[model samples]
Target: HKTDITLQEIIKTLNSLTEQKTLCTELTVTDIFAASKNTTEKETFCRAATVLRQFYSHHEKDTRCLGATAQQFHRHKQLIRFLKRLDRNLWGLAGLNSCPVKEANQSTLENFLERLKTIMREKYSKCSS
Candidate 1:
């Protein structure tokens, strides 16, 4: 469901669409999904999902560490869950992703939003300073 192409769509395109001068529809490997058609090629879909998932990935630490330290905002449990699950994993192999955060600390609701707004302000500068 998260991949770029399904064999069904591929098959449909193959029939419905056409290349410049051939019967082939132009779909890149990045768009060529491998699921729902053959398990032998499931790795193909899985890999594509992994690559495309980076944009949705995050290096943020659990905001629960904000426990007992909320300067503003209610620090509701939902906020913690929201931040933890901010970068949702839509990939098939989201179970063992290698991305991890180096460190993080709790901040005010306003500051948290501000930090993300100007996140790229530094090349990892002014962190927890």
Candidate 2:
């Protein structure tokens, strides 16, 4: 019998898995790319994380944007740690750099978001069994 899981259920599973140390080992950017069902979720998470990283890292240097108002510098720092872990585990999966340029450009941001979406779609479609 084929069982179709709700997206919410799947997300809950993802979140629960993230909380376990063993499961953390399996949760890398590459794993996200390989396990995602499509472009939307992948793009959303990647773009959000990237933007948050840019904002927080710059804030640390006292060079943040004029109107960026999020107070979760700690959360952003956590995202950076997560990204670094993903980079180490995935090893070239996303071509992610530790020192990504913090300057914002609309076109460049769009491109990064789209590329992440495409990569996630391509990898996941092929790998998910």
Candidate 3:
């Protein structure tokens, strides 16, 4: 499945961002998924897709960053686009709503990126089984 490979690539890209330490890796923001009340894998991806789309659209126009070079910042934009592609090709979402994103910069960006990686991996495991 294409979603499977996209999820893997999303995880791979997130891992590279985390490992390379391109952004400020501070705990300035809480877990993005903490408020998720749904446990099913589909809903999990829904919430993730919602939040990631919100974050990307939230910053789609501006040059936003903190302690991240322009290249690193754009790399994150690439990740977000990959995620949006995954969302569309997999779920065919009409639209995801009520998912408010806050104060996203490099730190919160990295924080949410890592958190998204966690669940994408979780979803990927299902494909393996």
Q: Pick the candidate with the highest TM-score.
A: 3
Candidate 1 lDDT, tens digit per residue, 16-77? 32221221211222222224444334444344333323211121222223223344224433
Which pairs clash (backbone N, Cα, C closer than 3 Å) in model 1? none
The models' CA-based lDDT, in order, is 0.32, 0.38, 0.51
Estimated TM-score for each candidate: 0.19, 0.31, 0.40
Worst lDDT window (10 residues) for model 1? Answer: 18-27
Top lDDT hit:
3
Global lDDT of model 1: 0.32
lDDT of 2 at 3: 28
In the range 9-32, model 3's lDDT, one tens digit per residue, is 555554544434332333344344
Point out the higher-scoring one by TM-score: 2 or 3: 3
lDDT for model 3: 0.51
Candidate 2 structure quality by residue, lDDT tens digits, 1-129: 132233233233323432232111111122223224443443434544555344224323223234224565456567656754453335332334344332222434334334544554454445334
Sorted by lDDT (best first), the order is 3, 2, 1
Look at candidate 3 and give me any clashing residue pairs: none
Q: After superposition, how far is residue 82 of candidate 1 from its true place, in Å?
A: 10
